[PDB]
Amino acid sequence: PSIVIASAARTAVGSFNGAFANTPAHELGATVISAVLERAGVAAGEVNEVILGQVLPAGEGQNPARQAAMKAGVPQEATAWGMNQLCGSGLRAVALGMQQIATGDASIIVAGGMESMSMAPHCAHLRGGVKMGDFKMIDTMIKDGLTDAFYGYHMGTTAENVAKQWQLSRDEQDAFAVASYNKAEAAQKDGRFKDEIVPFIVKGRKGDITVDADEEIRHGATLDSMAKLRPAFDKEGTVTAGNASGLNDGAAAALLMSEAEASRRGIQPLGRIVSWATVGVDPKVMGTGPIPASRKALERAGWKIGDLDLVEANEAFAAQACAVNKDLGWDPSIVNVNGGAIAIGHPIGASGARILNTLLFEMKRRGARKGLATLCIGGGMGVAMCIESL
Amino acid sequence: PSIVIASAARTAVGSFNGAFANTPAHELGATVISAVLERAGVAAGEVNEVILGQVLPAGEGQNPARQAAMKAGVPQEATAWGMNQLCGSGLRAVALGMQQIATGDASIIVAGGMESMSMAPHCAHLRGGVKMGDFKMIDTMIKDGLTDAFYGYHMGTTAENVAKQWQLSRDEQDAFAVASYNKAEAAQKDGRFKDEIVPFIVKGRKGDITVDADEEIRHGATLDSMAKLRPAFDKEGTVTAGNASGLNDGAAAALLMSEAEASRRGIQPLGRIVSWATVGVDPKVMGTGPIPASRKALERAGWKIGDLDLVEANEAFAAQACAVNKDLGWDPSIVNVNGGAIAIGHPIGASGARILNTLLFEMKRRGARKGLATLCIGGGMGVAMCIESL
Amino acid sequence: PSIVIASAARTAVGSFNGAFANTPAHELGATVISAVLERAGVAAGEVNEVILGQVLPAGEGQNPARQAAMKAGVPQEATAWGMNQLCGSGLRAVALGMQQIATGDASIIVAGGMESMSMAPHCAHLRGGVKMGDFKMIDTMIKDGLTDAFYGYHMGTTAENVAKQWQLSRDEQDAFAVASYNKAEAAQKDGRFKDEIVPFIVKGRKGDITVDADEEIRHGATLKLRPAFDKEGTVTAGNASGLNDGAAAALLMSEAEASRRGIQPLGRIVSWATVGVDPKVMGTGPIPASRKALERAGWKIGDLDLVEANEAFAAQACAVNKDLGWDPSIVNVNGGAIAIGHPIGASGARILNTLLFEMKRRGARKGLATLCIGGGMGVAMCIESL
Amino acid sequence: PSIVIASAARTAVGSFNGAFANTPAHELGATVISAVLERAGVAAGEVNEVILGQVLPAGEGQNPARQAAMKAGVPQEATAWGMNQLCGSGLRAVALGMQQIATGDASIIVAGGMESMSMAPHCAHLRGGVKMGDFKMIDTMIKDGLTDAFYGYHMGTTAENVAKQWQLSRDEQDAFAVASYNKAEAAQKDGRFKDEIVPFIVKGRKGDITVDADEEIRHGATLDSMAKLRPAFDKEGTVTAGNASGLNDGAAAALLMSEAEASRRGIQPLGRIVSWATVGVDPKVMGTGPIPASRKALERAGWKIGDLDLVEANEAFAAQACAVNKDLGWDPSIVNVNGGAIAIGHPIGASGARILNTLLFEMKRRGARKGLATLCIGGGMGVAMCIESL
Ligand SMILES: CC(C)(COP(=O)(O)OP(=O)(O)OC[C@H]1O[C@@H](n2cnc3c(N)ncnc32)[C@H](O)[C@@H]1OP(=O)(O)O)[C@@H](O)C(=O)NCCC(=O)NCCS
Ligand SMILES: CC(C)(COP(=O)(O)OP(=O)(O)OC[C@H]1O[C@@H](n2cnc3c(N)ncnc32)[C@H](O)[C@@H]1OP(=O)(O)O)[C@@H](O)C(=O)NCCC(=O)NCCS
Ligand SMILES: CC(C)(COP(=O)(O)OP(=O)(O)OC[C@H]1O[C@@H](n2cnc3c(N)ncnc32)[C@H](O)[C@@H]1OP(=O)(O)O)[C@@H](O)C(=O)NCCC(=O)NCCS
Ligand SMILES: CC(C)(COP(=O)(O)OP(=O)(O)OC[C@H]1O[C@@H](n2cnc3c(N)ncnc32)[C@H](O)[C@@H]1OP(=O)(O)O)[C@@H](O)C(=O)NCCC(=O)NCCS
Ligand SMILES: [Rb+]
Ligand SMILES: [Rb+]
Ligand SMILES: [Rb+]
Ligand SMILES: [Rb+]
């Protein structure tokens, strides 16, 4: 059976300790679940299961995916669960929801991801007791999200490894980053993010605040201020806070059903999932994950790289993003036409579904037929998905 | 395509802060991954993906499922990810791994679960700063594992709700718990756990320690000491520490492949996955999850309840376990013939695959044809899987 | 032997998480120690001992009094130690330094107090291990500084007991606070705090900042705030002292020693006293302590020309004034802790500086300083001009 | 006026996380306060002030000295306060209480020290907020008690500096420690600690426990077992866990009054405080503190070193104790005749009064006329007091 994406929605991507500084992840997820239901004309009582990727759920309670579905109005008869493949979680959950319908075990799936890096707590194992001496309170965002478990350094250090191998200069990475800011600022000014974004109401005591714009997009990002920044990981390196994605909060999801099911409801799907793939790479060069993952997804779809009309390649770092574009060789003018994670933000568990939303709504906006979304994953992995319009 | 379980293995279930008090979950997972590979004659270089359920991964680093695969020797080209459906995670990962082969996106999967509740840390959100006054260090095991997010009380309170609706006396729950201990002690004395258990070597500085026996199994559990215990949740209730499953550590997994693949390798599979199902219920009575989940799994398999030769129903609490048996009405003599989680232990993220091991190895020793494994899930959910012998 | 205060100095009182938000207490203390030494023309090598009161030293390292003396330049030959009598520590340390010279065990003492409530950490006992369940990270500032150990409620609740027993209305307590703000705001405009205050340089990365003015003084305090302790009480954030940082000290020596060095002392310690009261009604401590100090000095209440009574709460300050009956026009003529601030370990020496420098500015002969202490205690000291 | 010690008492010195593992310091102090009142026949209503040294009071509430006095029965009219001169606090509080009566501001003083190093908490400044990254939970016992504030290393490192200056071999320091253990073990067997020790009732839930014996006293400390221990501070040093004092809990105090007051009450004082002194030294060699302090104290008393009949020199480290004995040149057979802090323990805030108790009761037991007690203080200080029997 062919699985189509009947509808999709995402929240604005908030800055670290910014708009969503005190908003739990499942509250963002519930808003996205309700949005994809309204946009498709599907009631909450029809959803069979909710699959939400999430990397940092510590302290949010039992199964935040279940919390997001219940708050969105999904009945207790349905099920919900979370999964963690780091940065590719938001997109892998869509593939997993697609398989639930392919194997005949479900009919309607809400799949996506949600992440609140601001709400990540500090933790320490204290059951055995600290008999004597100091101990460390560990930042779960750094430890469980952004630090390689095999070599011990940050994900920006792996980007330094890619930067050294593909011989990408500091100027080339800054030029890529500046281009990402300008494309995102132009798209936001033209309102090209309005369709995918569902407004989120930050319920406050002093007054409610409606967040409907990605607050990481900077206006007037100059190349001179980008080249004045010091390297953020290697003191004699090339990756800085400017040419790297930041820490962000947000949620995104899609409504999944069979093509025949959408046809029975008179729904015009955003696209048809034709293939997907996930491949592992060396954890040292985790940013190269999209390279074998995209080729495997295109091979499963029977497509050549030139067949793609639009591409969404997540920009974890400027060094890894340039390497993926150079290795695969696709036309850069069709890759991230509205900017990328360097300017929009990188909410780990939701970025996979975030770029899926951006990919789906731009394919609809310009009539693209074949699209591809891909991300790199910490620990040395990549995930890719091919979408075709109906 | 038909998916069979080529092999399975589990660690001994360790007591809270006991043998595995300082052992990370992925170290337990790595031992199980290597075991199912040896027991099936499959090399680590052949594994496509590792899917491990885990509820409490805080503080263990990026994607502990990837850490278990790397330590077990699975190459970097493969992928790995974790997922969280609370107590049903260990069994749901097996269903998810089966779907990876059903949809043709993988050939060999190592699926299961791992959990180290002893290593669960205390956490607190400290980014905004505690300007004044005391604040709470939250136990992630209680918050993220054992507390309902909608009503705020422990899972033992939900067992009180089931006990009240089904009119289950304290004596009936104690009689069930004592029966669970006696069956487990007899099985352990007869060596019926020897095949499924792979020994785990607790690497210590003052000598290594080999753990190969479930250390929660009590020898000579009397009814008088069970009826003298005070209620552990409601001070005028019926659920106690004796008639309820404890806090435990452990890991379990299974190797999945198509029936044609296993036949090509001369493997005699432990069983064939014929169906699976997951259903949601009211979070107040989350212990009733196995009732609609088992009925849906049997309906998808085309089986009647009487067709089952062996049943493994997880004993989260004596009150919920008695209600599932009374409602479904299957012969209690074929349900948990070697005891259950009340005596063996309940490592949440791994219990789903744990009872699958007990089901698979008991089906083989007594020649059972049709089996079923099922668990209840916090938040009001259940999961069930039907297995048929080859 | 007669003990005189050869010189005195204090830092500006900083607001909670304000100017001294990241300044350790001993760094403020070191500046005060060096100040009282320069103002008297006495070298650091002549100081025998440094006695500094401090209530919240957790996390600052071994003996912060030793750290303050060494950083100020006091040589290793001298000794240093801290003491804790809560809000009376700053003044009790001066009496203790007076006894060191009276008993012939020392010649020159630098005594005072220092407190950094902003730098107070959160703590929890974790050696035995938390096997299961949540535990509390305890605010040491509240627990060890502002919470009664016998009845478990905040110090603002104890002020409600005093307010209820003495029948002090909300308007009467607020009127006292407004009068305290007006006297303090007026004194800072007239520059009457400039002599006693020694500037402190907050060493910063993006540039140094010199703090020389009490930043808690409110401009335009008008006569709406909700009660901060009792849901139906009278003590509010306005009629109560806040949380602050600061340090203050004095230089001690015999009167014959000061004459041999050509020093003109700010005053002479003639007597001192400390008495305890019921912890339920703390804040009445200055009443028996001042009477005992005046009795030891051979003075009547009318003999006092100037009085410094610490204003922990508006309710406790009114009770002390009503019971003792001294002229309110000579009590806290430049404001009090309600407007200036309340650095616990340093408040005792803070009002001593204000008392000494105002007696000198208007030629007062006899003065008295007194404070209330948590747990039901009071401390008082009588000062006479030369 | 002449100030005499009318009575004295101390608790047993408990091991780190041992008998007094969960006993607050003021509870140990209250027992000692009540003891010195009963042993002298003085009512609590006559005590003017209570002066208790304490180094680690974090988390115990407002003024633990006030808490100890109130719980002991001292009325609210009296006053109480604590002081901190590190390891010399217990003895300095006695000198401070002596000055209160000498200056005519008090008549009866209870002075001493109390310390619960087991109850010391871990702390961290969290008001400004930890925006990102790990932070350290600081052990207040190590930071505020055992770490030099000017050079940053432990007090055992300062003992290494003293050992190098006086050229003290590992064998000489171990031989000193062995002699300290043998003297303490013999005294405890002979009951020479019975008079000074007041039993403490550890109020427990499963039953009360009476602690009346120093639990650090080791039986049969040999030089062969002492030479197998590794150095505890310097990897190529000489100070080990065996030849150094440990971490302990305990309390001790003495009742102070004028000599004429004791005569009016028919009280026979344990001794008369004739002089005291405190001098500072280089913090690098803080162990030499007792040398100028004892010489200054003897000079103030008009005594020669040979006039002393009994000496109590606190054994912070075996290296520091040997240097003090060599410099002063007094007969080693009269120094710590019942053992020292190496075997008995070192409760920081109470050690000053602890060794004072041992000196007073041994001077009474053998009829010694002139005695001296001295300790070294972190940060480079020493304190000494001369006692004469009546
Ligand atoms: C790169 C990173 C360390 C930066 O966070 P940071 O250390 O707190 O540094 P900041 O974000 O506060 O920015 C630092 C400075 O650069 C400036 N700056 C940042 N981005 C800029 C830009 N795009 N243009 C111009 N100036 C910029 C900021 O204003 C700031 O100025 P300041 O020094 O006066 O404070 C953090 O965002 C990060 O870890 N990113 C990696 C995320 C990741 O690994 N995701 C997974 C990938 S698979
Ligand atoms: C029930 C629970 C609260 C117990 O907490 P606990 O107090 O730490 O349990 P403990 O065994 O450590 O202490 C219980 C007491 O009863 C006794 N006891 C326990 N089991 C006993 C038995 N089977 N027979 C006789 N006595 C027993 C213990 O020895 C102890 O007495 P003690 O103080 O002398 O040691 C905890 O195990 C729990 O939360 N279980 C929930 C599991 C769960 O929610 N699973 C998921 C559901 S979907
Ligand atoms: C003030 C205190 C009571 C806590 O109150 P808080 O609300 O938690 O913190 P603050 O009151 O300082 O915050 C300032 C607020 O007061 C208001 N406020 C206080 N005094 C005011 C005044 N005199 N005029 C106008 N506004 C005033 C400010 O506008 C501000 O409003 P906000 O609540 O919206 O922020 C705190 O200072 C305290 O605990 N003091 C105890 C004193 C003590 O124990 N001393 C020891 C000796 S016994
Ligand atoms: C020295 C110090 C670090 C101890 O290190 P420690 O390892 O934590 O002490 P421990 O008892 O836990 O370990 C000591 C080991 O040696 C053994 N040991 C100790 N003393 C021994 C002795 N006297 N004879 C034989 N064996 C001995 C212990 O049994 C233990 O064996 P283990 O390996 O099973 O633990 C600590 O006691 C210390 O810091 N002391 C200084 C206190 C201080 O500074 N006071 C201030 C004075 S100014
Ligand atoms: Rb950026
Ligand atoms: Rb049990
Ligand atoms: Rb105020
Ligand atoms: Rb020792």
| CB contacts, 8 Å: B124 with chain A | 59, 121-123
C157 backbone φψ class: left, alpha, beta (φ>0; ψ -120 to 50): alpha
The answer to whether A367 and A12 are in contact (CB under 8 A) is no
In chain D, the DSSP E strands lie at 3-10, 14-15, 49-53, 79-84, 109-116, 122-124, 135-139, 200-202, 209-211, 248-258, 271-280, 310-313, 370-377, 381-388
For chain B, the C-alpha Rg in angstroms (whole number) is 20
Residue B209 domain flag: no
In this structure, are residues B350 and B115 in contact, taking their beta carbons and an 8 Å threshold? yes
Q: How far apart are CA A342 and CA A318, in angstroms?
A: 8
Distance separating alpha carbons of residues B111 and B93, to the nearest angstrom: 6
Q: Which residues in chain B have their C atom more than 2.5 Å from the N of the next written residue, marking a break after them?
A: none
Q: Are C333 and C53 spatial neighbours (Cβ–Cβ below 8 Å)?
A: no
Nearest to A239 by CA among A165, A328, A313, A173: A173
* DSSP H or E stretch at residue A202: strand A200-202
D335 DSSP β-pair partners: D311
| C342 given a catalytic annotation | yes
Distance CA A201, CA A12 (A): 11
Nearest to D32 by CA among D195, D214, D250, D247: D250
- What does the block give as tokens for C248? 């203050």
Which alpha helices (DSSP H) does A256-337 contain, by range?
259-264, 290-301, 318-328
Tokens of A294: 């995209």
The answer to whether residue A318 is domain-embedded is yes
- Amino acid at the residue A156: G
Strand partners, A373: A312, A385
Q: From C32, C386, C83, B156, select the one nearest D66 (Cα to Cα).
A: C83
Tokens found for residue D356: 């004072």
d(CA B301, CA B388): 10
Nearest to C60 by CA among D133, D380, D145, D158: D145
What is the total count of domains within chain B?
1
Q: What b/e readout covers D105-119, taking b as 16+ CB neighbours within 10 angstroms?
A: bbebbbbbbbbbbbb
- Spell out which residues of chain B touch residue C139, defining contact as CB-CB under 8 Å: 130, 132-134
Residue B41 lies in a domain: yes
**DSSP per-residue string spanning D192-241:** TTTTTBPPEEE--TT--EEE-S-TTPPS---HHHHTTSPBSS-TTSS-BS
Cβ–Cβ < 8 Å for B183, B336: yes
CB atoms within 10 A of CB D42: 21
Q: How many CB atoms lie within 10 A of CB C212?
A: 13
Tell me the residues of C at the A interface, defined by beta carbons under 8 Å apart: 126-132
Which of D228, D232, D86, D247 is closest to D156 using CA atoms? D232
Which residues have CB under 8 Å from A280's CB, separation 6+? A289, A380, A381, A382, B75, B76, B77, B78, B79, B80
Cβ neighbour number for residue C20 with a 10 Å cutoff: 30
| Chain-centre distance for alpha carbon B332 | 20
Structural domain that includes position D94: 3-120+246-388
Residue B258: its H or E element: strand B248-258
**C-alpha to C-alpha distance for A158 and A148, rounded to whole angstroms:** 9
Rg of chain A on CA atoms, in Å = 20
Which residue has tokens 């039953």? D207
Give me the phi and psi of B329, to 5 degrees please.
75, 15
Is B155 inside any structural domain?
A: no
CATH code (residue D75): 3.40.47.10
Catalytic residue among C87, C123, C125, C219: C87
Which three-class secondary structure string do you get for D57-91? CCCCCCCHHHHHHHHHCCCCCCEEEEEECHHHHHH
In angstroms, the CA C91 to CA C374 distance is 14
Q: What is the DSSP string of C172-235?
A: HHHHHHHHHHHHHHHHHHTTTTTTTBPPEEE--TT--EEE-S-TTPPSS----PPBSS-TT-S-
**How far apart are the C-alpha atoms of B93 and B70, rounded to whole Å?**
19
CB contacts, 8 Å: B148 with chain A:
62
CA distance D302 to D310: 16
Set of chain D residues whose Cβ sits within 8 Å of the Cβ of A124: 137
Which chains pack against B, by 3+ Cβ pairs within 8 A? A, C, D
Residue C148 falls inside a structural domain:
no
Residue whose C-alpha is closest to residue D296's, from D312, D273, D280: D280
Q: Take atom 48 of ligand 1 and give the residue whose Cα is closest.
A: A316
- Contact residues for B13 (Cβ-Cβ < 8 A; gap 6+): B214, B215, B216, B248, B249, B250, B344, B345, B347, B354
Distances from the Cα of D153 to the Cαs of C72, C85, D143, D245, D382, in angstroms? Answer: 22, 30, 10, 17, 19
- Going by C-beta distance under 8 Å and a sequence separation of 6 or more, which residues neighbour residue D250? D10, D11, D12, D13, D14, D20, D28, D114, D115, D345, D347, D350, D354
Phi, psi at B137, each rounded to 5°: -90, 115
Question: Over the Cα atoms of chain C, what is R_g?
Answer: 20
Ligand 4 neighbourhood includes D226 CB (under 6 angstroms) = yes
Q: Please tell me the distance in Å from A271's CA to the nearest CA on chain D.
A: 39
Cβ(D111)–Cβ(D94) below 8 Å = yes
Angle at C316 between CA C313 and CA C317, to 5 degrees: 85
**Is C273 inside any structural domain?**
yes
Contact yes or no for A130 and D142 at CB 8 A: no
Token couple for C125:
């006992």
CA atoms within 13 A on the CB side of A265: 19
Pick the closest to residue A14 from A281, A247, A191 (CA basis).
Answer: A247
- Taking the C-alpha atoms of residue C67 and residue C38, their distance in angstroms, rounded to an integer, is 19
The interaxial angle of helices C344-362 and C89-102, nearest 10 deg, is 70
CA dist., res. B154 & res. D202, Å (int): 34
User: Ligand 1 in contact with A382 (CB < 6 A)?
Assistant: no
Dihedrals phi, psi of D154, to nearest 5 degrees: -65, 165
User: What is d(CA B54, CA B114) in angstroms, rounded to the nearest whole number?
Assistant: 6
| Residue A381 amino acid letter | M
Q: How far apart, in whole angstroms, are the C-alpha atoms of residue B327 and residue B378?
A: 19
Closest by Cα among B280, B182, B258 to B223: B182
End-to-end, the C-alpha distance of chain D in Å comes to 15
Active site residue B346: yes
Query: How many Cα neighbours within 13 Å face the side chain of B32?
Result: 36
D78, C105: Cβ pair inside 8 Å?
no
Angle at D284 between CA D281 and CA D285, to 5 degrees: 55
**D348 φ, ψ (degrees, to nearest 5):** -45, -65
Contact A8, A252 (CB under 8 A): yes
Give, rounded to a whole angstrom, the gap between the first and last alpha carbons of chain C. Answer: 15
Query: In angstroms, rounded to a whole number, what is the distance separating the alpha carbons of residues C19 and D366?
Result: 61
Interchain CB distance below 8 Å, B86 and A63? yes
Between A and B, how many residue pairs show a Cβ–Cβ distance under 8 A?
Answer: 202
Taking alpha carbons only, the member of A193, A211, A192 closest to residue A201 is A211
In whole angstroms, what is the distance from residue D270 CA to residue D273 CA?
10
CB atoms within 10 A of CB D53: 34
> Of residues C26, C154, C318, C342, which has the active-site annotation?
C342
Strands (E), C13-149: 14-15, 49-53, 79-84, 108-116, 122-124, 135-139
- H-helix segments, C333-385: 337-340, 344-362
* Beta carbons within 8 Å of B332's beta carbon, 6+ residues apart: B325
At position C232, the amino acid (one-letter code) is: E
- H or E element, residue A179: helix A170-189
Q: Closest Cα partner for B358 from B375, B382, B337?
A: B337
* Cα–Cα separations (whole angstroms), residue C182 to C174, C177, C178: 12, 9, 6
Q: How far is B170 from chain C (nearest CA, A)?
A: 26
Residue type for position B9: A
Identity of the amino acid at C307:
V
List of residues 6+ apart from A67 with CB closer than 8 A: A26, A29, A30, A60, A61, B149, B150
Question: How many angstroms is it from B226 CA to the middle of ligand 1?
Answer: 59
Using the Cα atoms of residue A133, residue A138, residue A144 and residue A149 in order, give the sign of their dihedral.
negative
- Residue D75: phi, psi to the nearest 5? -70, 165
| Closest of D351, D375, D381, D144 to residue D286, by C-alpha | D381
Which method was used?
X-ray
**CB-CB under 8 Å, A125 with B119:** yes
Contact B385, B373 (CB under 8 A): yes
Q: Is C372 a residue of the active site?
A: yes
Name beta bridge partners: C306: C367
> CA angle, B39 as apex, B114 and B93 as ends, to 5°?
30
CA distance D201 to D194: 16
Place of tokens 């080990």: D240
Q: How far apart are CA A10 and CA A91, in angstroms?
A: 13
For the packed helices B318-328 and B170-189, what is the interaxial angle rounded to 10 degrees? 90
Chain D nearest C-alpha distance from A133 (Å): 5
| Cα–Cα distance for residue pair B67/A151, rounded to 1 Å | 12
Query: What DSSP string runs through B61-88?
Result: -S-HHHHHHHHHT--TTSEEEEEE-GGG
Q: How many angstroms separate the CA atoms of D340 and A368, rounded?
A: 87
- Residue B148 covered by a domain: no
What values do phi and psi take at C303, rounded to 5? -70, -20
* Residue D196 placed within a domain: no
CB atoms A127 and C126 under 8 Å: no
Phi, psi of D15 (to 5 degrees): -75, 165
Residue from the list C132, C134, C142 with its beta carbon closest to the beta carbon of B133: C142
* CA separation for the pair B82, B80 (Å, rounded): 7
C-alpha D88 chain-centroid distance: 7
Residue D315 token pair: 């054994």
- The reported resolution of this PDB entry, expressed in Å, is 2.6
C-alpha to C-alpha distances, A105 to B62, B163, B234, nearest whole angstrom: 31, 32, 39
Token pair of C121, please? Answer: 């950490």
